[PDB]
Amino acid sequence: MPHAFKPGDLVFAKMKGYPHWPARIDDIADGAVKPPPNKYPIFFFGTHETAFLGPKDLFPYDKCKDKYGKPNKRKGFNEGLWEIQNNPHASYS
């Protein structure tokens, strides 16, 4: 039965104007800016951008990869597909 989201969880994250995108729940570094209430720091694979999103925009990667994990023309998407499959927990600094 499902738990709350936690850092390291792999998702597809949906933003207005973008296809469901490979992403992870990031940690927050000591001294780093924290998200708003009920939001999580979402690191988008490929673009390496962070947004703060709530669960309504977060889909589990494993369950949804058949639907959402196909190549896309959007910039950074296919790089992101590689990252989430092959080294999703790496440092992308």
Swiss-Prot record:
Cite the PWWP domain residue spans from the record: 7-64
Regarding tissue, the record states:
Widely expressed. High expression is found in heart, skeletal muscle, ovary and testis. Overexpression is frequently observed in hepatocellular carcinoma samples.
| Subcellular location field | Nucleus; Cytoplasm
Q: What does this protein do?
A: Acts as an epigenetic regulator of myogenesis in cooperation with DPF3a (isoform 2 of DPF3/BAF45C). Associates with the BAF complex via its interaction with DPF3a and HDGFL2-DPF3a activate myogenic genes by increasing chromatin accessibility through recruitment of SMARCA4/BRG1/BAF190A (ATPase subunit of the BAF complex) to myogenic gene promoters. Promotes the repair of DNA double-strand breaks (DSBs) through the homologous recombination pathway by facilitating the recruitment of the DNA endonuclease RBBP8 to the DSBs.
Q: How does the record describe its quaternary structure?
A: Interacts with HDGF. Interacts with trimethylated 'Lys-36' of histone H3 (H3K36me3). Interacts with trimethylated 'Lys-79' of histone H3 (H3K79me3), but has higher affinity for H3K36me3. Interacts with IWS1. Interacts with H2AX, POGZ, RBBP8 and CBX1. Interacts with histones H3K9me3, H3K27me3 and H3K36me2. Interacts with DPF3a (isoform 2 of DPF3/BAF45C). Interacts with SMARCA4/BRG1/BAF190A, SMARCC1/BAF155 and SMARCD1/BAF60A in a DPF3a-dependent manner.
Q: Which family does it belong to?
A: Belongs to the HDGF family.
The name on file for this protein is Hepatoma-derived growth factor-related protein 2
- Gene source species: Homo sapiens
